Design a protein around this ligand. Structure first.
Ligand code: HEM
Ligand code: HEM
Ligand code: HEM
Ligand code: HEM
Lengths: 146, 141, 146, 141
């Protein structure tokens, strides 16, 4: 994907401060809270009855860690997001049956979590760079759908 | 909001559909699955080949719900209450897909109603399916 | 954009039967009728008071002819839509201030018009090919936005 | 639909915004213009650089409209009627852009409300801005 040099530097600098497990659990838990129809893929996950239940659920935290871990790994390959996520794209389509709109919703909640956690440091230009990245990752994860 | 002219337009056009409603509902789904393959993620349990009984059945149920909605156009939230519950609480289809099916229902009506699909009727049908879609996603959160 | 050989063939065969001026006037008129906020760029165009006024407006027909003529010529360059539409992309952004979402709405109305015009010949597979094309042209016309 | 808990959440959050509403509205537009460049097509007559008084003015107007909507949360259609007419018949902003500005309003609120932006408040504010957006586009056709 094409990022300006400034954009790439902005993404890498902020990501160096991210606790991937913590941010992953927070963003994935907020996905299930804010867009609760996304819980359709997590029927075996236990208690998702209230926001606090969702956020504190160990399976939700564990799933967020896996997801953000793969996202984090993808940030090392910003010039080839489609190749980096091809295998996970096929998995999410063929085996998991997940509508790729969910990737966009997760991207929106991750940007809100970054803003909430970092506050003023998540400036308008930093956000714009992260918007390009979340759109790129969502596009990459949707690429092998058929 | 649907104006009185929109309601007249929709009743006239859906009235023309008549007995073919179910067939047109099936064709709209078939069109959607081919044009927008991500919508197939909601039907991994169906045979989606052309002519499938499951797709014909889906088409007929959706068409009957649209007939009901047209018949109760001034009180759609009530008429579609069970289906808004079903989509919000069980099926949980992402709201984005309602626009994809709506477009494919419009394309199917266009292809089958040469006389009736005027610019004004097209606009009214588009508004009506957007209204139906809004009712069906109203309880999602 | 990449089309199957069947899809390219399907697009070219139907397009050979199209009266570009007539379909352009019909699709552009229906854009302004069905999505009336698109009339924002056409305040100098005269009477747009009713659906018949819009469809019969000489300026609307002329605009349709110019749009579909460029679209038509773009179908000879399906393997290079971004290059083909680059200068028009720059113009629609820098000078005309057209939100690219309008390209998507025109694409949706064009598909409805081809379905209306051709009836049963506009099969599910033919539509799927045209959907790829109108998304491709809209993406190409949006590519130079900044 | 907005629940009683949503309305409570929105009033608490927006109440904490207080006198910074206009600043936050301006930041939301600034964020939107950079993140989603196509939204700049609606402001070719503005200087959109950081700190622009035109963007600060637009931010203040939008924020004041939102304070009014919060104040009249059970009667939004009427409170926002002049703005629904303005956007439908003059400005004619494509409806897709309201989701972009709403997302940027949430990101702005998140960046300024560490304590208040819990998961439940985030969900309420997202519903609220979707509701306001729906009212603002209700007369488009
Ligand atoms: C940045 C976006 C995402 C990435 C990188 C990602 C990545 C992953 C990874 C690495 C796994 C573990 C696969 C395995 O070892 O079998 C997984 C599982 C899964 N993902 Fe995603 N994912 C993303 C977004 C989503 C979203 C938004 C949803 C749906 C709302 C989703 C649905 C699932 C499901 C249902 C599973 C299997 C869960 C289980 O084990 O029961 N993914 N994903
Ligand atoms: C006009 C919009 C729609 C209407 C009126 C509608 C109506 C219905 C009806 C009447 C049923 C069957 C209920 C029953 O058997 O009790 C149903 C089921 C279903 N719908 Fe919706 N629907 C709409 C849009 C969608 C969309 C856009 C999707 C996904 C792309 C969808 C996915 C489903 C699924 C997966 C089922 C269950 C099918 C099965 O397992 O038999 N629907 N819908
Ligand atoms: C398939 C999509 C489209 C294509 C191929 C296209 C193509 C063109 C072309 C070839 C021109 C003339 C350029 C010139 O003078 O050098 C033009 C002008 C223009 N287009 Fe588009 N266009 C498209 C969609 C739209 C849409 C959806 C809108 C707004 C709703 C729009 C608004 C305009 C305007 C306002 C002009 C200037 C007209 C004039 O000066 O009389 N275009 N377009
Ligand atoms: C929360 C959603 C929104 C609210 C409450 C809102 C409210 C307002 C208000 C109060 C005004 C000033 C009216 C006046 O001066 O009489 C305005 C003007 C305007 N708004 Fe909206 N707006 C919203 C979304 C949008 C979006 C998404 C866009 C475009 C991306 C937009 C574009 C404009 C424009 C172009 C103007 C006129 C600016 C000028 O020329 O000074 N608005 N809006």
């Amino acid at each position: 994907m094409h990022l300006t040099p400034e954009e790439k530097s902005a993404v890498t600098a902020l990501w160096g401060k991210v606790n991937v497990d913590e941010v992953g659990g927070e963003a994935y838990g907020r996905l299930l809270v804010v867009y609760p129809w996304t819980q359709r893929f997590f029927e075996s996950f236990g208690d998702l009855s209230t926001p606090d239940a969702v956020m504190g659920n160990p399976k939700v935290k564990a799933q967020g860690k896996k997801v953000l871990g793969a996202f984090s790994d993808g940030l090392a390959h910003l010039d080839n997001l489609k190749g980096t996520f091809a295998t996970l794209s096929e998995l999410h389509c063929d085996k998991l049956h997940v509508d790729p709109e969910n990737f966009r919703l997760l991207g929106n909640v991750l940007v809100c979590v970054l803003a909430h956690h970092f506050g003023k440091e998540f400036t308008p230009p930093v956000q714009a760079a992260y918007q390009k990245v979340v759109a790129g990752v969502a596009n990459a994860l949707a690429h092998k759908y058929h | 909001m649907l104006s009185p002219a929109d309601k007249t337009n929709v009743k006239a056009a859906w009235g023309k559909v008549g007995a073919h409603a179910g067939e047109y509902g099936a064709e709209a789904y078939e069109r959607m699955f081919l044009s927008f393959p991500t919508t197939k993620t909601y039907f991994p349990h169906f045979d989606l080949s052309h002519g499938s009984a499951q797709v014909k059945g889906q088409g007929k149920k959706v068409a009957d719900a649209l007939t009901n909605a047209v018949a109760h156009v001034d009180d759609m939230p009530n008429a579609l209450s069970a289906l808004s519950d079903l989509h919000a609480h069980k099926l949980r289809v992402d709201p984005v897909n309602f626009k994809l099916l709506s477009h494919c229902l419009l394309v199917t009506l266009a292809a089958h109603l040469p006389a009736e699909f005027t610019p004004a009727v097209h606009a009214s049908l588009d508004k009506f399916l957007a209204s139906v879609s809004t009712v069906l996603t109203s309880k999602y959160r």
